[PDB]
């Protein structure tokens, strides 16, 4: 079984692309490959690579967003559990500002998102307990949280559908609401 | 909090790497990072490039290995559940060739191990399900499994302890068994 992707760009957020791969599945359960350079790195331009790979574990109810950046394209992904991975374009200047797109993302449907820079990204933890894998490209030094942005989860202008109005959320995106 | 990792070789197979990360906890969970090229790439040798992720899903009981190749460096952890990782030096001319050394890896241990090539990889799953998550180094194109050596998880010269003595196996793994039957 050679490795595969199917890649398509999103019908309503321009950069943002759908990636899925192939799974070899027997009784053991199933192996795949989230990326490769050769198939995938030609989709990110400019010279800028994947050179950083993050997990974040998270519990039912969680909803961590919406966050983003000015130079750093994200692969993001969910390896166990079941994730409402929510894109929201952030670029002022786009024609589709603070429209948004959802992908129920978990094993049974394994899509990976390429978000570009300057995009609002959030997920919210629809199972009991989920893993979020997230490929990160970019030259120079990482942003952290004082170098990002920050819309609300429940901006009026955003208006996205989320499974709950009372979700788990850490202090900075508590204080985005206000 | 800073993005750090601790590195160490093995005191028992030389040029086998343990790598530690640190972790943001919180009401939510645990955020780390895995791989930085900053931080990490170092592990393998200058124009060898860490450039294929791969995700192994597994049920209790399941056995996986012993494989190798002769080029393929790997780092491997277990991103959810828990499993044996034993790491086989398969080096035929090493002072250690057949001693084996085990990392038992959770989330409540986050290790990442380094093989270099012409190692044995191999892991059991203990948890219900478990999520492994290994990188592959390799130069050229990836050596699938007709271009990879086996040896049996129970070979009696490398004697392994293994939490069972019937794990679910593949067809590779099974037939591994009966070279000398
Ligand atoms: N679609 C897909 N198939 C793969 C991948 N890796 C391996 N395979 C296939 O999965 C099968 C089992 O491979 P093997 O290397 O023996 O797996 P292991 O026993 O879990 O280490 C083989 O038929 C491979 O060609 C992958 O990343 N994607
Ligand atoms: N150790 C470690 N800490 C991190 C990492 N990423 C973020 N943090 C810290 O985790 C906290 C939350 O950061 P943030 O980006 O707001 O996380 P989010 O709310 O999950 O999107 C901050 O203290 C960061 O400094 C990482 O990869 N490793
Ligand atoms: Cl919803």
Redesign the interface.
Known sequence: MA?KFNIKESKILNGVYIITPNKFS?????????????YLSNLVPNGI?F?????????FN?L?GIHGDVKTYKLVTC??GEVHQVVVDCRKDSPTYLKWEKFIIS?RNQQLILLPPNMGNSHYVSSK?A?Y?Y?LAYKGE?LDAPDQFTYAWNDKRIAIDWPTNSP?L?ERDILAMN
Not at 27 to 32: E, H, N
């Open positions: 490795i027997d009784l053991r359960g199933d192996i795949w490959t989230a990326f490769t350079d050769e690579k050179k950083h790979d993050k997990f974040i574990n998270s519990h969680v961590r390896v166990y094993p307990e893993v894998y490929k990482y788990i850490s």
